[PDB]
Design a protein around this ligand. Sequence first.
Ligand code: HEM
Length: 409
Amino acid sequence: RLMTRIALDPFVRDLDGESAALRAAGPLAEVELPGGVHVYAVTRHAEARALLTDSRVVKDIDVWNAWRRGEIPMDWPLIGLANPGRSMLTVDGADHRRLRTLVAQALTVKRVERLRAGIEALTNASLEKLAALPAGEPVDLKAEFAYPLPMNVISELMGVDAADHPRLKELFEKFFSTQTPPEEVPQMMADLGALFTKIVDAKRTNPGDDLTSALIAASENGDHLTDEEIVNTLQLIIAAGHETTISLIVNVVEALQTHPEQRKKVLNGEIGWDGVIEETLRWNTPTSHVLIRFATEDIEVGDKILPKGEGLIISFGALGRDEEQYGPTAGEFDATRTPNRHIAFGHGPHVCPGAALSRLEAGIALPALYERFPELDLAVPASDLRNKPIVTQNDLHELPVKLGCPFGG
Ligand code: HEM
């Protein structure tokens, strides 16, 4: 019954081809994660949503056969995604609701509107650094704009100091890469954990108006989050700032630089920016695979069975171009697509609580970019953009652009 097992390429050489093969193998495809670990992937939309709201599908790693049997090495480069420490991400039920509420409450659409002016300030400061670089030479818009801006917005929300950014960057590049030697993995996990522990100890004795301090202050407060849950939660929040928000900005520029008719309409005001962002989230999503869930008993998925104790990944890149959900134009980027009920942010109880923040950041960064630099284009052919060796995220090595001369519109 199952089509041939798909091995996810550790080098991410052909993400679009892999995505199309996952869709054809759906709704439940056998796959191999790098390091040789067999799991199932849900690769169609309607079945992903059903699985993500099924209480028989859990985050409890002791349910996983492969873990119980000793076949997942602790120095697997994906260990940090497959077995993260206790936090809202790794529990279900009432534990989950306790561990989520405060963070979700700080990040509603309204609490996030109040960060707008602070985000506008950091965006204009990043733009002044661009335009202050040597005119006419290519710039790497990822390292000079798309990386630093979301890292600053998220650091400021959580009160991380800028002196910690260089080591965070280096550690996160190892945490996400398939090429981190197993022998390096243990010390990377210890370093990340020691660095977040140190940040949380400092905030305890030196509060700020930042969300970490608010998590700490719900202490004399029916006990609420343990020290370890706060540290693990901080780590999880800050990993977004080195990953998904950067990718959304990069992928929006890449979509616009390859669809010149829509580009023109967007810079006009005939298609709104919000729609461009939503269609990028659907069509070229920042998170290719969401790790990882486990079946507490056999589950029907289409005509297949997800067996008890097996692992499940959600293949969002694949299912973002699902014709059953969006019709026969599902394959194409169309920024006016209107029912666009993608699940780039997940679905069910673990649905991204930061989604409104990421929309607000990209919705400010991107108009400000192209208002200041209305002839922005890629300095390389679009086909020469390449993915980093990060099997679960859709990230580019560089986004070389010609800014092409400031102001106006
Ligand atoms: C474009 C940006 C982003 C994308 C695409 C994204 C995507 C995701 C997805 C798919 C999940 C679900 C994981 C699962 O079901 O196992 C998730 C969870 C999460 N995201 Fe986001 N995310 C983004 C930005 C952010 C931001 C800015 C924050 C800031 C706080 C954040 C915090 C979280 C947290 C804490 C969870 C765990 C929620 C839970 O388990 O209840 N993310 N994200």
